[PDB]
Amino acid sequence: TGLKVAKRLHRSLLNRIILAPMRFFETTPLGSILNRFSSDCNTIDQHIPS
């Protein structure tokens, strides 16, 4: 369950961020997006199952 959740959530996250207006990127600090893409993804990948 944990592994399947990680896979589908990651591809949904990639699809959403890729198809987003460029003005949103320039307006968002881009540290929040990076944090929730790198650190938060790690936590859901290797911690939430166990």
Binding site: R16, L19, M22, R23, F24, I33, D40, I44
Partner: protein
């Protein structure tokens, strides 16, 4: 079992605290997943009704005024200057207004445009967004290159089989890089353009325009680059405006746009000066006074 309750309680609470924090991360991930924006589709039949590939880019500007929030302040104020098909157009307008107005009209990137803005004659709203930008060229100021095979970098989307990609990287600019590339066409760029040139992306954009039939062209200011680069760009624009019949320049180095067929200039919210020839540019000493 009463002996084991003593640590089951503790570890239940500890695991609950850890689960709370980890699910907070999931909430933030899902919150970014709730940005339901960037509608990409076509609100019209795009097979034949719009232009299959833009050729002339006749700007019949119908009082197109762009403001991103549409509430704070406008970026354009009824910017209506017809394009010059069959000839270059060097518009050294101020970055305050001209840059934002041109990008919104040409790319539909800033969707909130009061009225309508059409490139290639037909409306830009009635074509797929990715397709609309897939048949147009553009260059930028800040160099942004990744690491990968150059033959897989020039035309990655179409996976072109043309061996002319190496010719573009050997003739248009950076000839010595071919000898400096141990692989050649298939060679993988090093660390996203480490010590190649400031305008390696210029060669890539030229290759894309030559491949994707990108008749129209967009130019941006050069932060710092050898004058030979602007001379090669001018020659490429002459090629692009004698064959593809359209090329648009945007910068604040006026002498770059001085040698051009047409000229425009923007100030404090919208376009302030327009002229089909460049004779009025020298006649209206305002342009070159800002330069020098």
């Amino acid at each position: 079992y009463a002996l084991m309750v003593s640590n089951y309680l503790n570890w239940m609470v500890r695991n609950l605290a850890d689960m709370e924090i980890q699910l907070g991360a999931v909430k933030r991930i899902h919150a970014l997943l709730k940005t339901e924006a960037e509608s990409y589709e076509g609100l019209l039949a795009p097979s034949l009704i719009p232009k299959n590939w833009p050729d002339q880019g006749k700007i019949q500007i119908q009082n197109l005024s762009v403001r991103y929030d549409s509430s704070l302040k406008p970026v354009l104020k009824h910017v209506n200057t017809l394009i010059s098909p069959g000839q270059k157009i060097g518009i050294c307008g101020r970055t305050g207004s001209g840059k934002s107005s041109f990008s919104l009209a040409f790319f539909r990137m800033v969707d909130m445009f009061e009225g309508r803005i059409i490139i290639d004659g037909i409306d830009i709203a009635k074509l797929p967004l990715h397709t609309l930008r897939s048949r147009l060229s553009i260059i930028l100021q800040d160099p942004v290159l990744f690491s990968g095979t150059i033959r897989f970098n020039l035309d990655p989307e179409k996976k072109c089989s043309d061996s002319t990609l190496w010719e573009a990287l050997e003739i248009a600019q950076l000839k010595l890089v071919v000898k400096a590339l141990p692989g050649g066409l298939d060679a993988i760029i090093t660390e996203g353009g480490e010590n190649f040139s400031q305008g390696q992306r210029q060669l890539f954009c030229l290759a894309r325009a030559f491949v994707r039939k990108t008749s129209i062209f967009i130019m941006d200011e050069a932060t710092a680059s050898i004058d030979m680069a602007t001379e090669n760009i001018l020659q490429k624009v002459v090629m692009t405006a004698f064959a593809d019949r359209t090329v648009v320049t945007i910068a604040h180095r006026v002498h770059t746009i001085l040698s051009a067929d047409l000229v425009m200039v923007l100030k404090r919210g919208a376009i302030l000066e327009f002229d089909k020839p460049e004779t009025l540019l020298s006649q209206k000493d305002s342009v070159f006074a800002s330069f020098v």
